[PDB]
Amino acid sequence: APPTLWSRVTKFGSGWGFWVSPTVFITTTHVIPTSAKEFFGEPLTSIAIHRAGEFTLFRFSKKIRPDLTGMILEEGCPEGTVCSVLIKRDSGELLPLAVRMGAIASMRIQGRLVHGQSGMLLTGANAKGMDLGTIPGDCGAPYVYKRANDWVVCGVHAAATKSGNTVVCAVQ
């Protein structure tokens, strides 16, 4: 995946978030520190927060990442799209995990109620665990794909089943 997608992937709370543009940052709601009153040097009063379940978007009143171009953010993707989930792991290792996307779904995972775009990993069978699958620390990692000549971001990693074969993308 292009270097300019990896540069947008930012360590954040208990997981990750993603710079769509110089002013727009997306993440998974449950990774945000609940006590936090300041983000990237800006008070809450200077930030527009848009929350839909496990999808949160932050829009800043100043350019935080002026090195970036704005890219396309969509509300999930068509069934059958293959996405990459841009996961960072122990030691500057970069894991673009392949996933086949399916329907919008409501599920119960480890007792919690989860809603978003379902998908199934294309990394292996029985993918439970860090070598072929997701871990809790991956929440907030972006789902991206290439559409003709450009890249799209279409959500953030919210959950994975106990088996690890099914994942859920939170969507705008």
Per residue, the 3-state secondary structure of 58-125, as one string, reads EEECCCCCCCCCCCEECCCCCCCCEEEEEEEECCCEEEEEEEEEEEEEEEEECCEEEEEEEEEECCCC
At closest approach, how far in Å is the CB of 84 from a copy of itself? 6
Among 78, 124, 129, 136, binds ligand N08 (CB under 6 A): 124
122 within 8 A of 134, measured Cβ to Cβ: no
- The span of 32-40, 70-78, 108-116, 122-130 binding ligand N08 (CB under 6 A) equals 122-130
Six-digit token string for 49: 């927060």
**Measured from the CB atom, is 10 or 29 closer to a copy of itself?**
10
For tokens 């208990």, the residue is 14
Q: Annotated catalytic, 54? A: yes
Query: Residue 101 and residue 170: Cα distance in Å, rounded?
Result: 12
* Residue indicated by tokens 């953010």: 73
Contact call for residue 165 and a copy of itself (CB under 8 A): no
Q: x-or-dash pattern for a copy of itself, window 109-138, by CB under 8 A?
A: ------------xxxxxx---xxx------
From the list a copy of itself, ligand N08, none, partner contacted by residue 167 (C-beta under 5 to 8 A by kind): none
Q: Does 122 bind ligand N08 (CB under 6 A)?
A: yes
Binding site for ligand N08 (CB under 6 A): 121-122, 124-125
Residues forming the active site = 30, 54, 139
